[PDB]
Amino acid sequence: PLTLTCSVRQQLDTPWAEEGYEIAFYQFELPGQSEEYAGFMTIDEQDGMLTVRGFDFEHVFDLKKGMPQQVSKHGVPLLASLARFNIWRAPMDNDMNIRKEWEAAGLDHAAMKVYRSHWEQKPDASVEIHVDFSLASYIFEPFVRGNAVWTVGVSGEIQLKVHAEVRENLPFLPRFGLELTMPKGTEEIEYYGYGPHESYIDKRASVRKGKYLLSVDDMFENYVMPQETGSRYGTEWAIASTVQGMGLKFTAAQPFSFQALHYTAEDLTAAQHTYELKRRPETIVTLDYQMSGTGSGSCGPQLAEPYRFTEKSFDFELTIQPIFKEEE
Amino acid sequence: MELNREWENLSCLHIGRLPARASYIPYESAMTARTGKRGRSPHVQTLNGNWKFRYYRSVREVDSHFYETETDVSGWDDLIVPSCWQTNGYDQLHYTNVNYPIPYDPPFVPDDNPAGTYVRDFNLPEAWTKKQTRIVFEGVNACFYLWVNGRFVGYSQGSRIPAEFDLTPFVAAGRNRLAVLVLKWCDGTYLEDQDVWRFSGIYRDVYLLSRDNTHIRDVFNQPLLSDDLSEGKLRSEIETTGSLTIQAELRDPAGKLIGQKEAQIDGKGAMELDVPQPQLWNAEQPRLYELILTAGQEVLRFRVGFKKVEITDGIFRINGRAVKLKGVNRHDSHPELGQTIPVNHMIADLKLMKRHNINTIRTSHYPNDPKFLDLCDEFGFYIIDEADLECHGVHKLSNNPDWKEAFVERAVRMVERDKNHASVIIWSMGNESGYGDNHIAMAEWTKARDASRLVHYEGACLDLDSRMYPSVKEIERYALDENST
Numbered sequence: 001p002l003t004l005t006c007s008v009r010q011q012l013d014t015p016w017a018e019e020g021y022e023i024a025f026y027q028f029e030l031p032g033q034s035e036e037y038a039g040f041m042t043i044d045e046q047d048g049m050l051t052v053r054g055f056d057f058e059h060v061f062d063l064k065k066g067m068p069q070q071v072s073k074h075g076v077p078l079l080a081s082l083a084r085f086n087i088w089r090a091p092m093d094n095d096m097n098i099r100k101e102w103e104a105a106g107l108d109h110a111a112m113k114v115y116r117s118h119w120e121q122k123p124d125a126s127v128e129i130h131v132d133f134s135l136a137s138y139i140f141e142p143f144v145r146g147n148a149v150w151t152v153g154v155s156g157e158i159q160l161k162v163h164a165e166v167r168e169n170l171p172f173l174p175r176f177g178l179e180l181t182m183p184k185g186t187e188e189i190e191y192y193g194y195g196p197h198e199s200y201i202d203k204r205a206s207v208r209k210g211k212y213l214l215s216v217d218d219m220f221e222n223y224v225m226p227q228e229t230g231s232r233y234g235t236e237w238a239i240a241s242t243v244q245g246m247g248l249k250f251t252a253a254q255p256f257s258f259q260a261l262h263y264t265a266e267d268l269t270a271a272q273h274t275y276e277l278k279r280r281p282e283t284i285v286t287l288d289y290q291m292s293g294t295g296s297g298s299c300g301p302q303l304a305e306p307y308r309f310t311e312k313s314f315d316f317e318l319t320i321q322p323i324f325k326e327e328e
Numbered sequence: 329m330e331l332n333r334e335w336e337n338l339s340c341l342h343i344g345r346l347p348a349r350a351s352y353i354p355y356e357s358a359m360t361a362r363t364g365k366r367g368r369s370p371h372v373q374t375l376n377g378n379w380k381f382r383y384y385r386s387v388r389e390v391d392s393h394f395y396e397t398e399t400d401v402s403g404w405d406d407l408i409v410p411s412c413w414q415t416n417g418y419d420q421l422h423y424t425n426v427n428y429p430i431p432y433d434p435p436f437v438p439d440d441n442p443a444g445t446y447v448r449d450f451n452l453p454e455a456w457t458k459k460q461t462r463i464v465f466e467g468v469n470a471c472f473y474l475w476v477n478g479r480f481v482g483y484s485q486g487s488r489i490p491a492e493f494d495l496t497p498f499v500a501a502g503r504n505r506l507a508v509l510v511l512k513w514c515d516g517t518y519l520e521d522q523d524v525w526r527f528s529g530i531y532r533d534v535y536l537l538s539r540d541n542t543h544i545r546d547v548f549n550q551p552l553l554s555d556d557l558s559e560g561k562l563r564s565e566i567e568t569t570g571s572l573t574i575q576a577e578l579r580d581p582a583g584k585l586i587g588q589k590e591a592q593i594d595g596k597g598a599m600e601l602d603v604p605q606p607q608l609w610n611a612e613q614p615r616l617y618e619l620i621l622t623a624g625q626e627v628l629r630f631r632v633g634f635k636k637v638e639i640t641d642g643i644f645r646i647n648g649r650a651v652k653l654k655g656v657n658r659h660d661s662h663p664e665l666g667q668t669i670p671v672n673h674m675i676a677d678l679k680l681m682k683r684h685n686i687n688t689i690r691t692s693h694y695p696n697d698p699k700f701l702d703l704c705d706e707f708g709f710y711i712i713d714e715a716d717l718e719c720h721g722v723h724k725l726s727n728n729p730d731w732k733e734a735f736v737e738r739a740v741r742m743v744e745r746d747k748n749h750a751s752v753i754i755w756s757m758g759n760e761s762g763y764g765d766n767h768i769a770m771a772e773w774t775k776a777r778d779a780s781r782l783v784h785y786e787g788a789c790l791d792l793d794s795r796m797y798p799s800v801k802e803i804e805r806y807a808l809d810e811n812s813t
Binding site: 047048064065111113114115134136137138139140141142 | 388389427428429430431432433436438439
């Protein structure tokens with residue numbers, strides 16, 4: 001698919017702007033290995049840790065929590081700690097009314113309960129892991145009940161297919177996504193999608209589609225009251241890597257929401273001023289299915305119905321690939 | 329049956345646990361039995377003291393062969409049993425009100441379920457393998473497993489009720505080995521949502537009994553006062569394990585023989601005895617008869633009180649007179665030991681209550697230690713004995729029919745333990761905020777079993793009506809009405 005961009009630019013120097021300054025933009029869409037590496041696949045399990053080695057990778061899953069713990073590629077570690085599912089964001093200033101229902105319902109901090117875990121090996125040296133899980137906090141009925149299928153192939157890709165239902169008497173969730181933690185030194189972000197700045201389901205009129213390259217410190221927008229920031233709606237693919245280009249690549253079936261920061265969501269929630277934010281050495285990457293928009297609910301109407309995350313049965317379909325970006 | 333998750337099962341409440349009986353200690357003579365110190369008996373060996381202990385933040389990371397006989401437990405910690413481990417440097421203290429501090433997902437408990445392993449050696453004499461050997465745990469928080477000499481012997485569940493196991497196929501003369509695994513959370517945590525600090529561990533006494541091959545298994549004493557409180561009959565229903573020649577004798581509070589009898593009981597039978605002019609029990613004149621049973625090498629001592637509790641015209645009566653109960657509620661709580669209560673700390677509370685005009689105590693939301701009731705028989709207090717059940721839910725486990733055997737046994741194990749105490753006047757079926765089909769089964773079993781005491785349940789064939797926090801206008805509305813029976 002091809003993309004045409006038409007930008008309305010002026011021609012003379014105004015007292016406030018120069019010659020080639022842009023007033024508006026409009027975009028338009030235009031329609032237009034042979035059984036050699038399956039023998040290096042080895043699998044073992046000790047103390048619930050499923051280790052899968054291949055030709056040039058090594059991946060360690062925790063079977064009793066249903067999450068990957070270590071991802072390697074040519075010996076390089078690519079995760080710093082255990083992955084999780086996340087349903088909490090730092091509340092915005094347009095979320096002053098819905099935050100009382102979120103905190104009263106106990107969505108402030110939830111944990112994960114694994115009912116059953118089971119792994120196999122398909123007849124092409126491919127590994128499948130089936131997990132039945134539930135998200136719950138410590139007083140109430142569980143929020144999300146679902147099941148996930150992790151899949152490791154002969155090249156080292158990690159595919160996730162989670163089907164989840166959510167409880168019927170719950171207002172609407174802030175997000176639903178997979179949170180990973182990549183080690184120290186991951187500093188470049190390169191993504192194909194809408195940019196070069198933040199965009200949401202309802203605040204997306206100023207961004208345009210393209211291929212952008214920036215740093216993790218430039219993803220962040222330092223507000224006076226610290227809150228949720230830096231998320232890019234409708235991302236097609238994204239790579240988070242070091243300055244030499246050793247990292248991970250994320251794709252999906254339909255375009256997802258993408259975030260990369262040096263701050264976790266609880267750090268942005270607990271902080272009240274700009275100097276209270278302590279910068280972490282790691283890089284928190286989040287891959288959201290959907291995410292509820294901003295709105296203007298500080299004073300006036302609430303968030304609109306197509307802009308909320310009011311959906312109680314969904315599929316996710318994420319794909320993670322280790323990559324050395326300079327030679328792929 | 330090693331770790332098949334019986335603590336999330338609800339169809340496995342115990343493994344190999346003996347059925348419930350009354351509370352007694354087999355002594356060797358009537359002189360030793362009047363002392364009350366059970367360590368002086370040659371048929372009793374204590375297991376309190378110093379055990380080897382190891383704490384785990386999860387049941388996942390427990391070693392799979394800690395229970396074996398030839399393992400090295402020297403690098404482990406050393407913990408004094410009985411004690412709660414939240415007051416000994418282990419996991420942090422936690423108070424919670426009527427909300428569950430776990431996700432409400434019955435019957436499942438979180439994966440990070442903390443655990444503790446206990447190991448203790450002991451000796452055993454030569455004349456002990458010729459008889460039956462039992463182990464008794466007076467109380468363990470949540471659930472526990474049990475291994476003797478590296479062999480699985482039992483699993484049990486239920487935090488405030490004793491558990492007794494049979495160790496005759498497992499022990500030998502000389503050195504032995506005992507291993508216990510204790511978990512913090514089981515499926516019985518949903519039935520124990522008390523508004524109290526949440527402690528864990530082996531917090532009550534642990535001992536070993538040596539009972540011979542044909543022994544008196546269960547005793548239920550019944551005072552049988554007449555209609556005008558003028559003739560007494562002691563009916564002692566004795567349930568044995570075979571053919572026993574049993575001696576029995578009864579004495580007044582002054583220490584004089586008033587009855588004596590011999591019988592030959594072959595499994596289940598009574599031994600009635602007559603008291604011509606009885607001295608009655610009440611909270612301000614606590615007069616107690618003494619019953620001595622003798623069988624083989626065993627001497628059992630009981631303390632009997634004659635009383636009658638009734639309702640006549642909507643008027644509660646004890647021994648014919650109309651009595652107004654003036655009481656407080658009481659948790660077992662020590663500011664340094666948690667739910668481990670020594671004897672003098674009970675005696676101080678009873679003296680301080682009795683010098684402030686109090687005659688009733690309600691055991692709030694669980695049954696207490698078996699010697700608290702022994703003290704309350706002597707000082708004089710009316711006891712309302714509640715069961716260990718507080719399914720504050722909120723749902724409705726009370727109306728779920730596959731929880732019914734869990735609801736019923738928490739009353740069966742309580743009523744069978746405390747049925748020979750002269751101070752208990754009312755059986756209460758626990759804190760109720762919901763009328764359910766499982767509480768009425770408890771009440772029907774209790775009313776069929778023991779008819780000498782009244783049955784209380786809050787949610788509301790009822791005995792009495794109960795209200796939590798009325799106004800002063802509300803009770804004087806209730807009193808003047810004619811539909812109040």
